[PDB]
């Protein structure tokens, strides 16, 4: 049980990268409860987004979320070197449970 994400994605500096997160009607599509995490290897994960498109304070305006049907997405716009990292989604899935995505390695061209 794991949400589907592309293994990797790339973009040029200044451009954008979009990470999808696909589940089912009982998780991604059933709730507004998608989170996104950014992790550099061997560093703690950052919370980028919760509840599809809510930013904790401190996350720049260039990070946004969208959802339609059973797919949520994170876009990192205005790409910076700083943004190269693995990105993970998760969703509530009912029954007090969460499910996580497989992660996407983002690189800059
Ligand atoms: C019983 N235990 C400790 C917990 C732990 C975390 C939880 N998180 C949720 C988050 C979202 C939500 N929604 C219905 C969207 C439902 C829940 S229930 C829930 C139960």
Numbering used by the authors: 2 to 110
From the paper:
The crystal structure of Mcg with methylene blue shows binding at the A-site of the VL dimer cavity and coordination by the side chains of residues Y34, Y93, D97 and F99. The crystal belongs to space group P21 with one dimer per asymmetric unit, and the symmetry between the two VL domains of Mcg is broken by the presence of a sulfate ion bound to only one of the VL domains. The sulfate ion binds in the hydrophobic cavity at S36 and may block the secondary methylene blue binding site. Methylene blue binds through positive cooperativity. This result indicates the presence of two binding sites, one strong and one weak, where binding to the second site begins only after the first site is fully occupied. In the structure of Mcg with methylene blue, one ligand is bound to the A-site of the dimer. This differs from equilibrium dialysis results in solution, which indicate at least two methylene blue binding sites. The three experimental findings are: cooperative binding of methylene blue as measured by equilibrium dialysis, binding of the ligand to the A-site in the crystal structure, and the absence of monomeric VL in complex with ligand. Taken together, these observations indicate that the secondary binding site of methylene blue may not be available in the crystalline state, but available in solution. Secondary binding to either the B or C-sites may require conformational changes that are less favorable in crystals or induce the higher-order assembly of complexes larger than dimers. The ligand concentration that effectively inhibited amyloid formation in these assays was 500 μM for methylene blue and 250 μM for sulfasalazine.
Our work focuses on a λ patient-derived VL homo-dimer named Mcg whose structure and properties were detailed in pioneering studies by Edmundson and coworkers. The cavity between the two VL domains in Mcg is capable of binding a wide array of ligands, including synthetic organic molecules and peptides, which form contacts with the side chains of the dimer cavity. VLs exist in equilibrium between homo-dimers and amyloid-prone monomers. Likewise, mutations that stabilize the structure of VLs or covalently fix VL dimers inhibit formation of amyloid fibrils. These results indicate that formation of amyloid fibrils involves two steps: VL dimer disassociation into monomers followed by partial or full unfolding.
